[PDB]
Write a protein that holds these residues in place. Structure first.
Motif, PDB file in Angstrom:
ATOM      1  N   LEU A 245       9.732  -7.428  -2.456  1.00 58.16           N
ATOM      2  CA  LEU A 245       9.126  -6.604  -3.501  1.00 58.16           C
ATOM      3  C   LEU A 245       9.735  -6.890  -4.872  1.00 58.16           C
ATOM      4  O   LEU A 245      10.919  -7.198  -4.986  1.00 58.16           O
ATOM      5  N   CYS A 246       8.916  -6.793  -5.914  1.00 59.23           N
ATOM      6  CA  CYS A 246       9.345  -6.909  -7.302  1.00 59.23           C
ATOM      7  C   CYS A 246       9.378  -5.466  -7.816  1.00 59.23           C
ATOM      8  O   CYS A 246       8.324  -4.842  -7.940  1.00 59.23           O
ATOM      9  N   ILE A 247      10.561  -4.923  -8.091  1.00 58.59           N
ATOM     10  CA  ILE A 247      10.757  -3.515  -8.448  1.00 58.59           C
ATOM     11  C   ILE A 247      11.395  -3.285  -9.816  1.00 58.59           C
ATOM     12  O   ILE A 247      12.152  -4.113 -10.318  1.00 58.59           O
ATOM     13  N   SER A 248      11.143  -2.125 -10.423  1.00 59.19           N
ATOM     14  CA  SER A 248      11.731  -1.708 -11.706  1.00 59.19           C
ATOM     15  C   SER A 248      11.622  -2.776 -12.812  1.00 59.19           C
ATOM     16  O   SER A 248      10.520  -3.208 -13.148  1.00 59.19           O
ATOM     17  N   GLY A 249      12.751  -3.227 -13.365  1.00 58.86           N
ATOM     18  CA  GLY A 249      12.869  -4.248 -14.396  1.00 58.86           C
ATOM     19  C   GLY A 249      12.732  -5.663 -13.833  1.00 58.86           C
ATOM     20  O   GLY A 249      13.589  -6.510 -14.075  1.00 58.86           O
ATOM     21  N   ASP A 250      11.676  -5.904 -13.054  1.00 51.71           N
ATOM     22  CA  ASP A 250      11.359  -7.177 -12.393  1.00 51.71           C
ATOM     23  C   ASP A 250      12.485  -7.683 -11.460  1.00 51.71           C
ATOM     24  O   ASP A 250      12.670  -8.882 -11.253  1.00 51.71           O
ATOM     25  N   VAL A 251      13.234  -6.753 -10.864  1.00 48.80           N
ATOM     26  CA  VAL A 251      14.331  -7.033  -9.935  1.00 48.80           C
ATOM     27  C   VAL A 251      13.721  -7.310  -8.569  1.00 48.80           C
ATOM     28  O   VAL A 251      12.843  -6.588  -8.110  1.00 48.80           O
ATOM     29  N   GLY A 252      14.138  -8.388  -7.929  1.00 51.22           N
ATOM     30  CA  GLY A 252      13.642  -8.749  -6.610  1.00 51.22           C
ATOM     31  C   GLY A 252      14.459  -8.120  -5.494  1.00 51.22           C
ATOM     32  O   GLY A 252      15.678  -8.034  -5.580  1.00 51.22           O
ATOM     33  N   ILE A 253      13.798  -7.653  -4.446  1.00 51.32           N
ATOM     34  CA  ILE A 253      14.462  -7.121  -3.259  1.00 51.32           C
ATOM     35  C   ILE A 253      13.835  -7.753  -2.027  1.00 51.32           C
ATOM     36  O   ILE A 253      12.620  -7.912  -1.948  1.00 51.32           O
ATOM     37  N   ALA A 254      14.666  -8.124  -1.063  1.00 49.58           N
ATOM     38  CA  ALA A 254      14.244  -8.680   0.211  1.00 49.58           C
ATOM     39  C   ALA A 254      14.816  -7.798   1.324  1.00 49.58           C
ATOM     40  O   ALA A 254      15.937  -7.314   1.200  1.00 49.58           O
ATOM     41  N   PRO A 255      14.083  -7.565   2.414  1.00 51.98           N
ATOM     42  CA  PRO A 255      14.545  -6.706   3.489  1.00 51.98           C
ATOM     43  C   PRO A 255      15.588  -7.407   4.371  1.00 51.98           C
ATOM     44  O   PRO A 255      15.447  -8.589   4.679  1.00 51.98           O
TER      45      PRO A 255
END
Lengths: 102, 48, 48, 48
Positions: free
Chosen positions: A45-55
């Motif tokens: 997912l691309c969240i908030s201030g274009d920060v990437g998160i991976a599970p």
């Protein structure tokens, strides 16, 4: 040891050993899925201030219209947190846009 | 003719025994290589 | 056979695990994919 | 040769065991390649 099919086939949990005539008999205990649910998953997912998160060992799931996390080997939607996420300063392409997360 | 044929039988049977012994030894190396290939499949292709 | 994630993400996470920042990896995804299929073509042309 | 004894039976037996080892090895390699492989029925060779 972190070796996938070394201790028998499938999702190896643990092994035990017993003596056998001219050798050893290993009992490999594995995690066996019984029933499955087909679900729509996001690998990132691309969240908030274009920060990437991976599970971490799981997937991101749309549950109750909200973004949630589930383990890859058992369906149990739980809230997304730093415990089940790998952070990236920039999100990769095709990561689902989720500005409302965190 | 039996004496001559017996010399040939003995030579040919000795040659088959030598070939069989070499083939057993070579298949041991093939089994070792197949185990390495299975390990590389599991620990390099299906996982890292 | 790719740890339950897309192949490109598996390549990116594997390169990241070597000590490469994810910021250069996710912005150079096309360069990484082209380097990967060029490496595959180099292996194929190497049999000639 | 028939008056020689069980020499040919022993040669055939060792080669049959060696070939059985090669066959068992090929089955183990194929099992290793196919282990845990789950594919979608929607996969097509002409489009993907």
């Amino acid at each position: 040891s972190p070796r996938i099919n070394f201790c028998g086939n499938g999702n190896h949990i643990l092994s035990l050993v017993q003596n056998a005539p001219y050798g050893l008999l290993f009992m490999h205990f594995s995690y066996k899925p019984i029933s499955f649910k087909t679900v729509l998953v996001s690998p990132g997912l691309c969240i908030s201030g274009d920060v990437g998160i991976a599970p971490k060992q799981g997937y991101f799931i749309k549950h109750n219209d909200h973004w949630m996390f589930t383990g890859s080997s058992y369906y149990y939607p739980e809230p997304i947190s730093d415990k089940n996420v790998v952070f990236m300063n920039t999100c990769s392409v095709n990561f689902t846009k989720a500005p409302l997360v965190y | 003719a039996q004496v001559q044929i017996d010399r040939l039988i003995n030579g040919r049977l000795t040659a088959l025994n030598a070939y069989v012994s070499q083939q057993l030894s070579d298949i041991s190396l093939v089994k070792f290589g197949a185990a390495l290939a299975m390990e590389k499949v599991n620990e390099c292709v299906k996982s890292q | 056979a790719a740890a339950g994630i897309p192949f490109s993400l598996n390549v990116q996470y594997r390169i990241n695990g070597l000590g490469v920042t994810m910021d250069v990896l996710n912005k150079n995804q096309k360069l990484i994919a082209t380097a990967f299929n060029n490496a595959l073509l180099s292996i194929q042309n190497g049999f000639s | 040769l028939s008056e020689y004894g069980t020499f040919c039976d022993n040669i055939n037996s060792i080669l049959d065991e060696v070939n059985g080892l090669l066959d068992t090895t090929q089955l183990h390699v194929a099992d290793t390649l196919m282990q845990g492989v789950t594919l979608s029925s929607n996969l097509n060779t002409n489009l993907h």
